[PDB]
Paper text:
[name]-[name]-2 utilizes a trimeric [name] for attachment to the host cell receptor angiotensin-converting enzyme 2 ([name]) and for the subsequent cell entry step which involves the fusion of host cell and viral membranes. Given its crucial role in the viral replicative cycle, the spike protein represents an important therapeutic target and is a critical antigen in host immune responses. All emerging variants contain defining mutations within their spike proteins, with multiple mutations clustering within the receptor-binding domain (RBD) impacting both [name] binding and antibody neutralization escape, while mutations within the highly antigenic loops in the N-terminal domain (NTD) across these variants reduce antibody neutralization. Given the rapidly changing mutational and antigenic landscape of the [name]-[name]-2 spike protein, a structural understanding of spike protein mutational effects and the discovery of broadly neutralizing epitopes is of importance.
To identify structural mutational impacts on [name] binding we next determined the cryo-EM structures of variant spike-[name] complexes. All mutant spikes exhibited slightly higher affinities for immobilized dimeric Fc-[name] when compared to wild-type. We did not observe major differences in spike protein expression across the variants, and all mutant spikes tested demonstrated marginally enhanced ACE-2 binding potencies relative to wild-type. These complementary assays demonstrate that the totality of mutations within each variant S protein enable slightly enhanced [name] binding, suggesting a contributing factor for the increased infectivity observed for these [name]-[name]-2 variants. Superposition of local RBD-[name] complex models revealed no significant structural changes. These structural findings confirm that mutations outside of the RBD do not modulate the positioning of [name]-contacting residues at the receptor interface via allosteric mechanisms. Our structures of VoC S proteins in complex with [name] demonstrate minimal structural changes in the RBD, reflecting its functional constraints in cell attachment, only permitting mutations that preserve the [name] binding interface.
Numbering used by the authors:
A (entry chain C): 14 to 68, 77 to 143, 153 to 176, 185 to 247, 257 to 298
B (entry chain B): 299 to 620, 641 to 675, 691 to 694
C (entry chain C): 745 to 827, 856 to 892
D (entry chain C): 943 to 1041
E (entry chain A): 745 to 793
F (entry chain A): 992 to 1041
The structure:
């Protein structure tokens, strides 16, 4: 079942500063009180990240995946529930679905027929995100990942047929923009998908009383191949990082 | 020392002659806990099987496939593997497993093979010549035969052309054997291609129903996730063993560690990116990897003109891991430690010197 | 620990022997350097118990009896301010003996002038 | 920065040792930097070639380390000879040599 | 300027960093040598007219 | 082909750097001698013969 949303208000996308966000652990290796230089797909410091709103604004477009995706979420009341991954987003090719419903998180790699406007609805009794599921190659059910009160950082990577999902939960009290600080993203789950992904789309949840969009805001950043100098403390968490290509001082 | 110096007379001094290697004693191969086994219960122990024309294909992914349970069973009459050996199935890993299940006659089991010819191969189920997998068949007269006759199993008897490998034909169109059009009615030269089997429990062994499961193993560029169950050797600590933890291998002494890892971290590295800490996959505990006590072997001797007594210094080796005395330089064997202080004759190190008076340090 | 690698490595001859011999030469050279610099006296001199030197104070350079290492305050400060087949051989002379050699040199140059360097 | 001269020697030796360890993680054109992976993933005719590539790369690294250590040893020996000269002429006697 | 050559060269490790470090050490050593030999006075003396 | 050229050029560059280090050591010794002559012959009168 699909429903066209025709009550949106047209608005240009916003842009903002990445500051020192988007850092994640490159590997599953503990390091103590040491500085490690690594070459990987990292998000550039102080970069231009695209800002999307949900307020009548309901921003669910399809964006190019490129080499990786940094997803930042200033979230309250859990509007954002999942993501859409693929190349053509139809039954011709194979697509990846990430959903967090009221009980658990479901990850599926199948040939899905996506709606033009996919969404959920809130008791949660409205699921309108797909119309078909034909050929499945991978299914995985896991534990649930989840003023704006919550900040959710995610990193999605497609390297050698591995899908890396990195995530971090942060307690913030900032009203509008991204807070300035350091928070290294822990690796959450590696998925054996082995599929091509070039486009993605956020999945939101409707509020029904037509429909109402809950207050949420999210940010999209793009990963570029670069070198970071990571600092590991005595307890083994990354507390600070240096972008080697940002300015001559950090170089 | 004479061998190393290429001389039969050795001048007084200390000569580094060899190296002392602690030899590894055991092999410790710890991989993760054996969980999430593959659904072989729903294929082999199914209450009903499909017909050979409409053979069931089940995709097996994201689990651990234990092939020794199937191989060591005595319930299977045929376990013929083509393109791979059964012994290494429990070790190798594959991206996906295709389990094709059907029922055929006793005499038709031979036709489920690459390069064969028959009704089943040409018209019902065709295997490729370059097939990697195993064909498992067993007698099912107890379940699939009834006294009245079990006509729930169908097979294709006629088709215009032979089937392609891994093709399913479920068409029920009237076969045209003659020039005349069938017109949808079964008359002369026009026969229905699907014919029922008539399994009965009083049949011969060549006509009794046999359940056949064919496993197809393919490797694709996607990450292979159907792996065999890697066995785990019990953990041994405080000894120089060869460790293999989740594919990270090496040689070392595994001792208890006070390092508190974060839950996502598995291995530990120092400044020089060498693994000195590790997390055991079976039990989530942290182990320090101390390198085995390799050291230099030096021979301390006076002149051969004076005496043939020698002492051995193991550099940087504790005396419990090899007239035995412990020095900061290493373990000295063959020299009697004295409390008196003299001038240095043969330098040992860390303030220790050796002399001949027996050999004293 | 790879036996095949060692078998292939034996084809290259005595490269390993040359590297080990060069490192051994460097290691004995360091001890020889320390011996040449610090061990220039064969008598261990000590200062008198009463530090009456005509008004000259040497407390900052003489060994401190309170410290277990028997180092001078300046030497203690200097020591505080300095912060796969690999082995580190210990030096032949320990830090205590090097401090003792410096103490002997200081005692000789304070109590005997330059006479101790040229004779009794 | 009073004691920079000793700290430079300590830093150079430690950095050279660190570089020598980090050269082990380089494959030098082979498929992997681990001998076990090559021995387990390839047959002996090609594993011999890959192991040979690792052997020549590591041997070149070790020769480079030993050569630079020898040069530094020569420099330290010269400095120690100078220090022994200062010990003999400035401490054990009074020197008329200017500066 | 070949990027493929640099990608293959990165497999050999930090040889280039070592060579650059050695050359930098020699280059600063030459300036240190000149500074040690000629700059032994901190006052610029001048002869009388 | 690039592997052969890289190993040859790397060996050449390592040889050049080693020769430069040895020559730099020789020049450093000569410069230390020159500084000693500057201190003892120019800034003072030396009793050392020759
Ligand atoms: C919501 O709008 C989309 C956008 O037009 C509709 O998608 C079209 O569906 C028709 C159906 O035959 C196709 O011919 C068009 O090519 C589609 N266009 C795109 C851009 O996808 C969608 O069908 C609408 N939803 C419903 C339920 O009608
Ligand atoms: C020699 O100098 C030392 C150190 O400068 C003098 O020791 C000091 O004595 C005063 C007087 O009690 C104390 O307040 C200082 O704390 C002492 N300094 C130290 C480092 O202990 C010493 O008195 C001087 N004279 C003699 C004869 O030793
Ligand atoms: C971000 O990009 C937009 C257009 O893509 C541009 O108008 C804006 O100035 C950019 N911001 C920065 C800080 O460069
Ligand atoms: C969430 O989705 C899973 C997968 O289909 C399902 O088992 C579960 O019942 C769903 N929960 C809700 C509340 O819809
Ligand atoms: C994919 O699905 C279509 C229709 O559902 C089917 O005809 C086709 O055979 C399937 N292909 C694979 C590889 O599963
Ligand atoms: C992935 O998809 C993009 C867009 O459809 C295509 O251009 C590219 O060739 C694909 N890559 C692979 C390896 O299939
Ligand atoms: C490590 O954590 C402990 C408590 O878990 C804390 O007291 C300590 O300050 C931390 N150390 C660092 C370097 O952050
Ligand atoms: C299937 O049935 C047999 C016979 O009872 C039993 O031994 C076996 O454990 C069952 N399961 C499998 C996976 O073979
Ligand atoms: C692994 O299984 C053993 C018992 O076989 C159990 O004691 C242990 O807690 C398990 N470990 C994990 C991480 O599941």
């Amino acid at each position: 079942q699909c429903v066209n949303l025709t009550t949106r208000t047209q608005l240009p996308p916003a842009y903002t500063n990445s500051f020192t966000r988007g850092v994640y652990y490159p590997d599953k290796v503990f390091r103590s009180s040491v500085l490690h230089s690594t070459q990987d797909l990292f998000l550039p410091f102080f970069s231009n990240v695209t800002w999307f709103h949900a307020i009548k604004r309901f921003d669910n477009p399809v964006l190019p995946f490129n080499d990786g995706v940094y997803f930042a979420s200033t979230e309250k009341s859990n509007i954002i529930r999942g993501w859409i991954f693929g190349t053509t987003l139809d039954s011709k090719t194979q697509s990846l679905l990430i959903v967090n419903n009221a009980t658990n998180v479901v990850i599926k790699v199948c040939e899905f027929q996506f709606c033009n406007d996919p969404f959920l609805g809130v008791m949660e009794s409205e699921f309108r995100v797909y119309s078909s599921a034909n050929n499945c190659t991978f299914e995985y059910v896991s534990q649930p990942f989840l003023n704006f009160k919550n900040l959710r950082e995610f990193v999605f990577k497609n390297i050698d047929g591995y899908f890396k999902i990195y995530s971090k939960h942060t307690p913030i009290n900032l009203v509008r923009d991204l807070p300035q600080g350091f928070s290294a993203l822990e690796p959450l789950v590696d998925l054996p998908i082995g599929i091509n992904i070039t486009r993605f789309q956020t999945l939101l949840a409707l509020h029904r009383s037509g429909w109402t969009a809950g207050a949420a805001a999210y940010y999209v950043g793009y990963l570029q191949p670069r070198t970071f100098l990571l600092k590991y403390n005595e307890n083994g968490t990354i507390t600070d990082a240096v972008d080697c290509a940002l300015d001559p001082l950090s170089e | 020392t004479k061998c190393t110096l290429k001389s039969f007379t050795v001048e007084k001094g200390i000569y580094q002659t060899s190296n002392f290697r602690v030899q590894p004693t055991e092999s410790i191969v710890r991989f993760p806990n054996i969980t999430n086994l593959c659904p072989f219960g729903e294929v082999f122990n199914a209450t009903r099987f499909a017909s050979v024309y409409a053979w069931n294909r089940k995709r097996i992914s994201n689990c651990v496939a234990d092939y020794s349970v199937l191989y060591n069973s005595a319930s299977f009459s045929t376990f013929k593997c083509y393109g791979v050996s059964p012994t290494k199935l429990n070790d190798l890993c594959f991206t996906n497993v295709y389990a094709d299940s059907f029922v055929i006659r006793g005499d038709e089991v031979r036709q489920i093979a690459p390069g064969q010819t028959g009704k089943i191969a040409d018209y019902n189920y065709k295997l490729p010549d370059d097939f990697t997998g195993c064909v498992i068949a067993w007698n099912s007269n107890n379940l699939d035969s009834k006294v009245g006759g079990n006509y729930n199993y169908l097979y294709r008897l006629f088709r215009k052309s032979n089937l392609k490998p891994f093709e399913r034909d479920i068409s029920t169109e009237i076969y045209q054997a003659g020039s005349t059009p069938c017109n949808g009615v079964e008359g002369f030269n026009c026969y229905f291609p699907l014919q029922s089997y008539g399994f009965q429990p009083t049949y011969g062994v060549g006509y009794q129903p046999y359940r056949v499961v064919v496993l197809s193993f393919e490797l694709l560029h996607a990450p292979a996730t159907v792996c065999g169950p890697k066995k785990s050797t019990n953990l041994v600590k405080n000894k120089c063993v060869n460790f293999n933890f989740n594919g990270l291998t090496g040689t070392g002494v595994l001792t208890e560690s006070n390092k508190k890892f974060l839950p996502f971290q598995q291995f530990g590295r120092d400044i020089d990116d060498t693994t000195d800490a590790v997390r055991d996959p079976q039990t989530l505990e942290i182990l320090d990897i101390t390198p085995c006590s390799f050291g230099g072997v030096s021979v301390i001797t006076p002149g051969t003109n004076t005496s043939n007594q020698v002492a051995v210094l193991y550099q940087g080796v504790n005396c419990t891991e090899v007239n035995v005395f412990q020095t900061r330089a290493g373990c000295l064997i063959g020299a009697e430690h004295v409390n008196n202080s003299y001038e240095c004759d043969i330098p040992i190190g860390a303030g220790i010197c050796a002399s001949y008076q027996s050999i004293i340090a | 620990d790879s036996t095949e690698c060692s078998n292939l490595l034996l084809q290259y001859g005595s490269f390993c022997t040359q590297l080990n011999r060069a490192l051994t030469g460097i290691a004995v050279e360091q001890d020889k350097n320390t011996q040449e610099v610090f061990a220039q006296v064969k008598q261990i001199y000590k200062t008198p118990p009463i530090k009456d030197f005509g008004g000259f104070n040497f407390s900052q350079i003489l060994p401190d009896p309170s410290k277990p290492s028997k180092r001078s305050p300046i030497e203690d400060l200097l020591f505080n301010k300095v912060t796969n087949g690999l082995t580190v051989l210990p030096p032949l002379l320990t830090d205590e003996m090097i401090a003792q050699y410096t103490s002997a040199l200081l005692a000789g140059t304070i109590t005997s002038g330059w006479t101790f360097g040229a004779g009794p | 920065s009073a004691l920079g001269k000793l700290q430079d020697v300590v830093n150079q030796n430690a950095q050279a040792l660190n570089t020598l360890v980090k050269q082990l993680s380089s494959n030098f054109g082979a498929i992997s930097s681990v001998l076990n992976d090559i021995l387990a993933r390839l047959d002996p005719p090609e594993a011999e070639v890959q192991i040979d590539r690792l052997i020549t790369g590591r041997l070149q690294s070790l020769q480079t380390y030993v050569t630079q250590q020898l040069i530094r040893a020569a420099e330290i020996r010269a400095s120690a000879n100078l220090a022994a000269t200062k010990m003999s002429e400035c401490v054990l006697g009074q020197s008329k040599r200017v500066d």
